[PDB]
Design a protein around this ligand. Structure first.
Ligand SMILES: OC[C@H]1O[C@H](O[C@H]2[C@H](O)[C@@H](O)[C@@H](O[C@H]3[C@H](O)[C@@H](O)[C@@H](O[C@H]4[C@H](O)[C@@H](O)[C@@H](O[C@H]5[C@H](O)[C@@H](O)[C@@H](O[C@H]6[C@H](O)[C@@H](O)[C@@H](O)O[C@@H]6CO)O[C@@H]5CO)O[C@@H]4CO)O[C@@H]3CO)O[C@@H]2CO)[C@H](O)[C@@H](O)[C@@H]1O
Ligand code: NA
Length: 827
């Protein structure tokens, strides 16, 4: 026998009603006790007969009304049940509740018809989704994107989502705001993108140590190649995570390798933080430099040399860095830093931006093949529109620059979208040439001198020659040093210059290492304005001829001079095993300057086709190459398992922090077996490997949680996006995951870490006043360990509220707190 009592759910548990943490969604599906198509015969449902909630329950009558009209005007009209555009067009929130429901019940008969006709609940589901977008309060737009399509919410405490409550979530505790005592200042904000991890929670801080220890012992712990272990870190988003963790990493690295005393041990376990805010240098300096500061000089370099229009004066290569090189003749004073011409984020900014120019802010279909073709094309032209001008000159500056650990971009040596290392860039010959010159000649003090608003001479005086007047200590002193002349005006008048090479280089012969020509660069003097060898006068002054050139390699002038020698030479300074200062980890000096970093990836690095093309395998094959190039320290891509749907599959979208790929399931870069082998190939050639460690976010966690949220600016303070705002809302965010990796390995090394190094777990963190807590392992990430998430494209009106004001609820399984309460139309 039949009746409408059967719209009732078959059971008020999770087996028949969709719920997240006990709560219901208007996008949710449930199993009624029965359905009907005509009104007369009602059929019991099978456990496979599931129907969307938005057919039976609505946020308000206004919405019930729009659900009815939308469905009718989209294929679900039937006049034999009184449903045509004509029968629904006058209905409104003012209509009798008793009438509207009869109309809704009749629509439901028609929906059952379409399901029968189509033999599936697909077009229904696709219609529910399309319907929802029409409704302001129910749509993704209710979560209030900003005008650029960006935004974040914060996770807060709430009586309904109390399992997601935290005592911590200290936000934007970065840099000089580790104590939360200058929120208004120069810190660096909490939220980038993704599900933001609360690195202020003591338990999280313990998990970060666990992680770091696994990574520093990767090959061993995983039973892969046992010499396949990382030596250090590149810290992603370091300005955007509670600075406690940077303290804590420092401490682990000091405990494990004894770095404070020994520059040799410090220098063999290099770490560098991504983050250029000058406040960051201050912080690092005040802390004794546990990591290397990221210097801003690449930005200067692109601004002075790289632009087509609007080029900043040449003097800025002198002062536009955390190090002033007007005349830098001292050691252990500079902030220990790493610098570059290009990084992964600059190259992406440019390719995106080309994407929106070539397609009017449109649907982002993958015409990034189009942007990349345009880049390669502009790259080769003299009169470039986008791509950096003067790329050889920028590396000339960087590789001659004292008091930095320079970082080379894979993409500046190779065509980054072709298969890994398959295609050398046009800039390969220049750069590699300058890299090899560095090992052989670049040492001693530095003087950068203006000779025009557009011309500069950067001279290094050679190993063991501290400044212009020094005689020379080292036996390489005489035959080392370098002049790098850079002009940034292609119209510069032909002219003679003088370059003071220092008193250590009176009456000395100088090879034309690299000079500009009509077509580009010559490596042997052919076609330049200067001969292959020149000699200094009795005062050590070099006379050189320079002019403006304009071709794909140079828009300005570039020339490099190094001493003539008969032999290979290496001016690298070994570090001693007791430091000029016991308060310091890293020190900016000859030893640290002898290091050189290589970024071994690009975000637009293509998926490997075969196993032979795994970057890890190709890296293990060319270890000696990097070594030959004077590279000492290999920055490797985040090797973690990624979100399936990610744009670039590049490493920053982390889904498992411990799964670095297996034989059948590699990252873009390869399997973890293969990772270990590359690492050990590098070691075998005397190089060191650092891992990109991503403590800031995870992206693609599959498990939804009901959490309570407040539309917030990117510092975790509530914001008032175009008039509107919202606080204390229920939100069904994706917050939970980790992979088997987080489960197998999460917290596993903490007892070993406590036994060997107890100070880690007694040292009170600055932001919390409380030491990392190793007594709870994290085997799965969830909201309780997260500050919030970037906007997730779901909307804020999904949570079902009963007419009386309370959210609908189910005592389900783990969900057993309060008393069950379902809508009228489901019981
Ligand atoms: O395409 C083959 C080619 O892949 C490599 O390049 C890949 C890259 O390194 C890797 O990161 C990946 O990135 C994405 C991936 O593109 C996504 O598809 C996604 O992967 C999930 C995927 O959606 C699912 O299909 C599923 O994948 C696997 C099983 O779990 C595997 O065990 C495997 O089983 C066998 C299969 O049945 C056979 O037909 C045969 O292929 O042999 C397999 C055993 O070796 O394949 C199924 C699918 O058939 O689960 C995946 C999640 O783990 O998410 C990844 C990011 O998370 O995709 C790149 C290519 O698009 C690699 O370089 C080449 O060597 C390789 O031959
Ligand atoms: Na953060």
């Amino acid at each position: 026998g039949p009746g409408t009592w059967e719209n009732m759910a078959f059971a008020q548990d999770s087996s028949a009603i969709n719920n997240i943490n006990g709560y219901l969604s208007y996008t949710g599906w449930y199993r009624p006790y029965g359905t009907s198509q005509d009104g007369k015969t009602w059929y019991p449902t099978t456990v496979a007969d599931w129907r969307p909630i938005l057919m039976y329950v609505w946020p308000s009558k206004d919405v019930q009304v729009k659900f009815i009209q939308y469905f009718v005007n989209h294929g679900y009209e039937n006049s034999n049940y009184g449903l045509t555009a004509g029968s629904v067009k006058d209905l409104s929130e003012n209509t009798a509740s008793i009438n509207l429901n009869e109309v809704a019940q009749n629509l439901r008969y028609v929906i059952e018809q379409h399901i029968v006709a189509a033999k599936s609940t697909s077009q229904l589901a696709n219609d529910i989704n399309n319907f929802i977008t029409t409704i302001p309060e129910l749509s993704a737009s209710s979560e209030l994107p900003d005008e650029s399509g960006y935004g974040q919410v914060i996770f807060v405490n709430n009586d309904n989502t109390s399992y997601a409550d935290s005592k911590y979530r200290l936000m934007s505790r970065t840099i000089n705001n580790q104590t939360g005592n200058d929120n208004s200042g120069d810190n660096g904000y909490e939220f980038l993108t993704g599900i933001d991890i609360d690195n202020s929670n003591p338990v999280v801080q313990a998990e970060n140590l666990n992680w770091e220890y696994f990574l520093l012992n990767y090959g061993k712990l995983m039973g892969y190649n046992p010499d396949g272990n990382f030596d250090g870190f590149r810290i992603d988003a370091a300005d955007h995570i509670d600075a406690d963790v940077l303290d804590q990493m420092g401490q682990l690295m000091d405990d494990m390798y004894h770095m404070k005393g020994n520059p040799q041990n410090a220098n063999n376990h290099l770490s560098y933080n991504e983050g250029y805010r000058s406040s960051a240098a201050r912080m690092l300096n005040k802390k004794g430099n546990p990591q290397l500061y990221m210097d801003y000089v690449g930005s200067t370099l692109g601004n002075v040399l790289g632009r087509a229009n609007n080029r900043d004066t040449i003097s800025n290569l002198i002062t536009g860095s955390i190090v002033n090189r007007q005349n830098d003749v001292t050691e252990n004073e500079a902030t220990p830093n790493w610098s570059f011409v290009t990084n992964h984020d600059q190259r992406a900014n440019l390719i995106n931006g080309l994407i929106i120019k070539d397609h009017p802010g449109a649907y982002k279909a993958e015409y990034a093949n189009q942007a990349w073709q345009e880049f390669y094309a502009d790259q080769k032209k003299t009169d470039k529109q986008y791509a950096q001008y003067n790329v050889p000159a920028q590396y000339a500056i960087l590789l001659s620059n004292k008091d930095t650990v320079p970082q080379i971009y894979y993409g500046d040596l190779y065509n980054e979208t072709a298969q890994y290392m398959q295609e050398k860039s046009i800039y390969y010959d220049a750069i590699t040439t300058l890299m090899k010159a560095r090992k052989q000649f670049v040492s001693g003090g530095q003087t950068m001198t203006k000779l025009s608003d557009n011309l500069i001479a950067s001279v290094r005086y050679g190993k063991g020659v501290a400044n212009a007047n020094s005689e020379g200590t080292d036996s390489l002193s005489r035959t080392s040093g370098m002049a790098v002349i850079v002009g940034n005006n292609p119209q510069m008048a032909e002219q003679t210059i003088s370059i003071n090479m220092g008193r250590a280089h009176a009456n000395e012969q100088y090879r034309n290492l690299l000079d500009t020509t009509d077509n580009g660069l010559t490596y042997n003097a052919d076609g330049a304005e200067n001969p292959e060898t020149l000699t200094t006068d009795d005062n050590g002054i070099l006379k050189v001829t320079v002019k403006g050139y304009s071709n794909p390699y140079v828009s300005g002038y570039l020339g490099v001079w190094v001493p003539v020698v008969s032999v290979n030479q290496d001016v690298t300074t070994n570090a001693a095993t007791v430091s000029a200062d016991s308060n310091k980890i890293f020190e900016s000096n000859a030893a640290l300057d002898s290091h050189m970093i290589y970024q071994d990836f690009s975000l637009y690095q293509p998926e490997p086709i075969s196993t032979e093309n795994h970057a890890y395998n190709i890296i293990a094959q060319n270890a000696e190459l990097f070594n030959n190039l004077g590279i000492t320290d290999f920055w490797m891509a985040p090797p973690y398992t990624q979100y399936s749907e990610s744009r670039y599959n590049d490493g920053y979208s982390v889904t498992d922090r411990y799964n670095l790929g297996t034989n059948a399931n590699p990252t873009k870069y390869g399997s973890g077996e293969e990772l270990a082998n590359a690492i050990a190939a590098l070691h075998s050639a005397g190089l060191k490997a650092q891992v990109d460690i991503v403590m800031n976010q995870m992206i693609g966690l599959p498990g939804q949680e009901a959490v309570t949220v407040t539309r917030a600016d990117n510092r975790g303070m509530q914001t008032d996006v175009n008039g509107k705002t919202y606080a204390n809302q229920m939100y069904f965010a994706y917050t939970t995951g980790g992979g088997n990796g987080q489960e197998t390995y999460g917290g596993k090394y903490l007892s070993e870490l406590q036994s060997k190094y107890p100070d880690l777990f007694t040292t009170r963190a600055i932001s919390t006043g409380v030491a990392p807590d190793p007594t709870t392992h994290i085997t799965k990430w969830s909201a309780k360990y997260e500050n919030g998430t970037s906007l997730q494209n779901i909307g804020i009106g999904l949570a079902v509220k009963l007419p009386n004001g309370e959210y609908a609820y189910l005592r389900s399984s783990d969900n057993k707190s309060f008393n069950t309460l379902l809508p009228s139309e489901i019981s």
